């Protein structure tokens, strides 16, 4: 049986001065079955008219039952549970065992998520808080750089790190992954070099788990050694150390060490995750060695490497009505006092009388110093059956106000929301901004279309997402 | 209650002393009474563009016993020459043949719209699985060789006599703008309404009218079903046309049609006067390069022939030809396709002939092909020869199937030369499969100069 899943997004913006442009994106996935051999392919088409195809993953896998493993051939990706997740081109013999992004938009913004240089998700978003959920990242092991391009007041860029749960294994169970080939990047700044990566996980009695890994290259050597216990009550803890001997593009030899801590809490929904990784001055990843020293946003420099990485992802259930999420990350670098901070907090209350939702977004990157603090508040009051909406946005030194209605038609599937209000605040002048959207969701055969207008900018977007 | 869809993928990568990708999809959506039908063609060249052909939503009105399509559709080419349109229509409730020298990609396109793209192995090739979008006008098929050689031959749609019962009354009234497809054509509005009647003793009569800003036409005809002799249909057309400029013209066109009785017979002859012009011709603007056309030298006499004869259990013979004459010019447009085939488990003989000639071209393209297969764990030693106007080809090894039933393959190698230039060594190995309609074929070809690798995925989903 063959399966396919696509995600289309096309917007045509029209404004004065001559900034009118048309952009279209298509995130398609294709799966083919020709007798045990499972072919999987993921390609992204990007178009910007101020037109290139981008291949991410194309592999052909075979499941081996007698050995409890699966052998994949071609363009695939490695699991980033022990080391940093990397894309490859070759073969992988791994045992066949076994992210949500939050943010607030100013107005009509273009959601663009990129992982490993590859463009994975593209969509258009109305002002306020948004949740994605539907995206399946190709090469889901590394960090995800998500940027929302606004019209005119163009941007806020922030990267979301790979969330990892403490490495736990059942007693007697062994999970291994051996791969050999060359390093794939997709991003036009890296080299492709041959490597050999082999990881191992073993379950120990009394909830303990021993795990290690080795990734050898022509220019890079690493070793891992770690333990992880399962308590259940109070959650789980996992500690691992990594030794790395890396030679940079300038042939400079470096000795590096990195300690890693992972914490979890037992599972309404009460997910808790605290992760801390501290790296030395001479510590570099496998991706760091493959580079051209300097290029150039998305600016990299090997002189300022990663130091301390704090992560926090907590969820609290304050009754059936109230749901609170709090996700945060912090990154420090050697040399400069610049840091990378990403913080998302959403507080929600939903029941058959009124709908309250408070949202907070704190984004701070290096080289910019400036931090974007966003406060969002949406109030929905249900009453043929309509629902009155009240949305307010506060970003930095600018404000946005709106108050109107929005409900669903055709029993359940069809939905419409025609917003109106004023937008202005800090830059430019105080004008009036309003939009109208139409979305139809069948058996995962979605089709959305919207029209937006301000005092100078006009938007017209369309999107189709279908999965078989 | 289902959305059925039918796809046709074709990818080809070349490496010589570029990569191509083509997709042909037929989308269908059925909820309640409305039927959303879509036809889109995707193309990719690496020396990317989207092209839609038909996108409409149709409702079956049962009390009046008529369909109601809205959007982008096509008119039925039974009385007038069928055209693609954007608007509304209230209507009541072909295999191609060719010969290729080497591994070449074949592009079939009608009325400007690209409908089918696939690469085929050397020798006589048959598609059979083509789904022509806007199936009414003439079909144009181009075969781009490894050498940059194109064999263009226009074999039109097979025209059948109009048949109706006794109590049946077929009608179709359409109104909207003419969809061009290709460039160099304008966008005018039209109104077209046809009617057909069926009477006793095999007779039927039909009429039709076309009205536009710069085009007027009216037509009527008679048809007869004779059984043993087959079917005969004669109709007359008068059309007032004003051209791209401002000159006004008027003509009468007569169309004769014949069918008899596998033994499928088809003869269609259409003779037109000097002042007669089609609705598609008026949309143009004079004359243009790139598909050459000249309205000063309009179509005169069209002779279409499609015959098939069964000589026995072993032998099959088919002939498909079309001949066109023009006013004020002695030059003739000729297309011809002949094919003999004999197979009876012991030996396989197949002959193929192709004759192509255009109005703006001086030299003809006479092609002759011959394939001899000798069957024998099971194997079949195959041969092939390609011979044309001052050029020759030689290749043969074997071609058989593994796993049985569906998975079949063919590996051939030989020396190709010909004439204009020099001779070289060629060879190709291809795999093919059809288990469960949703199939994929893998092909590899090598030569002394050009190396090719291609794959095609054709399938059809339902539910």
């Amino acid at each position: 049986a063959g399966l396919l899943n696509y995600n289309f997004s096309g917007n045509s913006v029209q404004n004065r001065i001559g900034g009118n442009s048309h952009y279209a994106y298509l995130n398609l996935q294709s799966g083919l079955n020709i007798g045990a051999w499972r072919l999987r392919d993921n390609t992204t088409w990007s178009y910007n008219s101020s037109n290139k195809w981008q291949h991410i993953n194309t592999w052909l896998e075979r499941d081996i039952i007698p050995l409890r493993s699966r052998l994949t051939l071609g363009d695939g990706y490695t699991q980033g549970d022990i080391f940093d997740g990397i894309n490859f081109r070759g073969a992988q013999l791994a045992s066949d065992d076994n992210p949500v992004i939050h943010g607030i938009a100013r107005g009509t913004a273009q959601v663009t998520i990129k992982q490993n240089g590859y463009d994975i998700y593209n969509s258009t978003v109305p002002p306020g808080p948004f949740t994605i959920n539907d995206i399946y990242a190709a090469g889901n092991s590394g960090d995800l750089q998500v940027t929302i391009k606004e019209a005119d007041g163009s941007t806020q860029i922030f990267t979301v790190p790979y969330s990892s749960v403490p490495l736990l294994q059942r007693e007697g169970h062994t999970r291994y992954s051996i791969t050999a080939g060359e390093y794939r990047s997709g991003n036009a700044q890296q080299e492709k070099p041959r490597f050999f990566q082999s990881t191992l996980l073993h379950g120990l009695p009394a909830g303990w788990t021993i795990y290690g890994g080795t990734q050898l290259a022509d220019r890079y050597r690493a070793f891992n050694f770690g333990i992880g216990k399962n308590m259940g009550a109070l959650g789980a803890l996992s500690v691992d150390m990594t030794q790395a001997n890396s030679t940079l593009p300038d042939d400079s030899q470096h000795d590096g060490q990195s300690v890693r801590f992972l914490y979890n809490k037992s599972l309404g929904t009460n997910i808790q995750l605290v992760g801390y990784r501290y790296s030395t001055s001479g510590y570099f990843n496998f991706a760091d060695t493959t580079y051209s020293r300097m290029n150039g946003t998305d600016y990299y420099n090997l002189a300022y490497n990663k130091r301390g990485k704090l992560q926090l992802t907590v969820t609290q259930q304050l009754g059936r009505t109230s749901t609170l999420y709090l996700s945060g990350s912090h990154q420090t670098y050697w040399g400069t006092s610049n840091v990378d901070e990403q913080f998302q907090a959403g507080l929600n209350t939903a029941f058959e009388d009124i709908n309250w939702t408070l949202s907070y977004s704190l984004t701070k990157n290096a080289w910019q110093k400036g931090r974007d603090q966003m406060l969002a508040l949406n109030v929905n009051i249900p009453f043929a059956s309509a629902s009155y909406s009240m949305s307010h946005d506060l970003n930095g030194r600018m404000t946005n106000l709106a108050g109107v209605y929005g409900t669903l038609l055709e029993d359940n599937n069809l939905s419409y929301s025609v917003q109106t209000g004023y937008a202005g605040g800090g830059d430019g002048n105080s004008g009036s901004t309003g939009y109208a959207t139409l979305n139809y969701r069948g058996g995962y055969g979605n089709a959305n279309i919207g029209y937006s207008h301000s005092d100078d900018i006009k938007q017209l977007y369309y999107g189709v997402s279908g999965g078989v």
Side-chain angles (χ1 to χ4, degrees), chain A:
Chain A
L3 47 82
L4 53 93
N5 186 39
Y6 60 91
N7 194 294
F8 189 82
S9 184
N11 178 49
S12 59
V13 61
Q14 175 61 234
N15 64 315
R16 211 151 285 185
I17 87 100
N20 37 43
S21 298
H22 320 276
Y23 59 89
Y25 298 97
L26 184 61
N27 306 309
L28 64 91
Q29 287 83 52
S30 59
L32 285 87
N33 288 252
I34 50 160
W37 282 104
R38 299 161 83 258
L39 183 71
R40 296 290 177 271
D41 187 19
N42 196 340
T43 49
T44 300
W45 175 69
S46 59
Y47 178 78
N48 291 309
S49 184
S50 299
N51 194 100
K52 284 181 79 180
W53 279 88
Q54 192 175 222
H55 146 75
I56 312 163
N57 284 109
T58 312
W59 72 76
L60 182 68
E61 59 186 318
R62 157 80 75 151
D63 294 48
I64 310 160
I65 315 160
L67 293 161
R68 195 80 170 94
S69 292
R70 51 172 66 180
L71 185 72
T72 177
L73 293 159
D75 299 41
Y77 63 94
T78 60
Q79 196 175 332
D81 57 301
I82 294 166
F83 296 101
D84 293 45
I86 54 157
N87 295 290
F88 76 98
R89 191 182 289 180
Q92 178 184 115
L93 187 72
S95 58
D96 45 20
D97 293 48
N98 299 318
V100 62
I101 310 298
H102 295 265
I104 310 162
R106 316 272 176 86
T108 314
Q110 180 195 327
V111 182
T112 312
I113 313 169
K114 287 181 281 180
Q115 190 183 224
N116 250 315
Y118 304 102
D119 196 11
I120 49 159
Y121 189 80
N122 298 297
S123 185
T124 47
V125 70
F130 64 92
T131 52
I132 34 97
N133 297 48
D134 58 67
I135 181 65
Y136 188 84
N140 188 42
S141 290
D143 298 344
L144 292 86
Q145 189 187 125
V146 45
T147 175
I148 44 162
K149 193 179 181 290
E150 206 74 358
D152 232 10
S154 50
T155 17
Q156 46 180 129
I157 314 159
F158 65 103
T159 178
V160 178
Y162 170 77
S163 299
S164 185
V165 285
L167 294 87
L168 303 168
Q169 203 74 33
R170 303 276 184 89
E171 205 284 322
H173 287 70
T174 313
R175 196 176 75 90
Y176 71 98
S177 183
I178 309 159
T179 177
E182 76 184 28
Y183 170 82
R184 288 204 296 105
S185 60
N187 199 355
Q189 56 187 42
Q190 297 193 293
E191 228 288 46
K192 345 156 159 176
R194 64 173 183 162
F195 77 100
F196 175 78
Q197 188 181 127
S198 59
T199 52
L200 199 145
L201 288 85
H202 190 82
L204 304 165
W208 290 90
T209 304
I210 183 80
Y211 61 95
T214 54
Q215 46 181 31
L216 302 163
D218 291 30
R219 292 206 139 197
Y220 185 82
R221 281 186 171 91
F223 318 93
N224 194 256
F225 192 83
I227 53 162
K229 194 182 194 150
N230 189 39
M231 293 177 286
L234 282 83
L237 190 74
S238 189
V239 185
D240 57 296
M241 298 173 165
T242 319
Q243 168 60 45
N245 294 313
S246 59
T247 59
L248 295 170
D250 63 338
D251 290 40
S252 62
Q253 298 190 322
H254 289 266
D255 184 47
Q257 292 80 32
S258 185
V259 68
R260 182 180 165 184
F261 297 95
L262 291 162
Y263 187 80
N264 203 285
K265 192 81 177 290
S266 59
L267 65 150
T269 314
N270 292 314
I271 307 298
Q272 187 265 2
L273 199 148
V274 174
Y276 184 80
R277 174 184 273 189
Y278 187 82
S279 299
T280 54
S281 59
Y283 184 80
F284 293 96
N285 295 317
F286 177 74
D288 292 43
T289 48
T290 156
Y291 251 146
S292 299
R293 176 56 51 172
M294 286 155 193
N295 183 282
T297 183
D298 62 276
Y299 181 81
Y300 67 91
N301 197 23
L302 284 309
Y304 312 110
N305 66 107
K306 294 176 180 180
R307 187 179 180 179
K309 179 64 187 66
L310 188 73
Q311 284 196 265
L312 195 144
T313 311
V314 296
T315 314
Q316 263 277 286
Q317 192 78 209
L318 301 160
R320 181 68 192 90
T321 54
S322 300
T323 48
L324 170 69
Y325 66 92
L326 194 86
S327 58
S329 61
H330 191 97
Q331 176 73 257
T332 54
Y333 295 94
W334 290 96
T336 44
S337 299
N338 286 15
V339 295
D340 238 55
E341 259 143 75
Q342 169 266 317
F343 201 88
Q344 299 298 320
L347 185 211
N348 194 294
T349 313
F351 58 103
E352 203 69 42
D353 281 308
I354 195 163
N355 200 317
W356 297 86
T357 169
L358 199 155
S359 295
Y360 175 76
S361 184
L362 170 66
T363 60
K364 190 183 178 180
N365 287 13
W367 63 259
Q368 62 178 39
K369 180 74 182 179
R371 25 84 87 91
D372 297 49
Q373 292 189 238
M374 294 193 76
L375 285 157
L377 178 71
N378 284 243
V379 186
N380 291 51
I381 309 159
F383 286 91
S385 184
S387 299
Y388 207 91
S389 59
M390 280 280 186
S391 58
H392 333 288
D393 291 66
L394 179 72
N395 158 143
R397 204 58 191 157
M398 64 88 73
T399 182
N400 201 328
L401 279 307
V404 74
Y405 67 94
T407 186
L408 38 284
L409 278 166
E410 289 182 37
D411 292 313
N412 295 314
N413 44 32
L414 192 72
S415 298
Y416 75 102
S417 195
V418 185
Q419 267 64 227
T420 181
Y422 99 98
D427 267 0
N429 62 316
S430 184
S432 184
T433 312
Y435 68 95
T437 183
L438 288 153
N439 193 198
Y440 173 78
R441 292 178 176 262
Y444 202 68
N446 316 328
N448 59 293
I449 184 160
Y451 175 82
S452 185
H453 70 91
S454 244
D455 59 306
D456 58 328
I457 320 292
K458 289 180 180 180
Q459 285 266 331
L460 189 73
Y461 56 88
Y462 43 86
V464 179
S465 60
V468 182

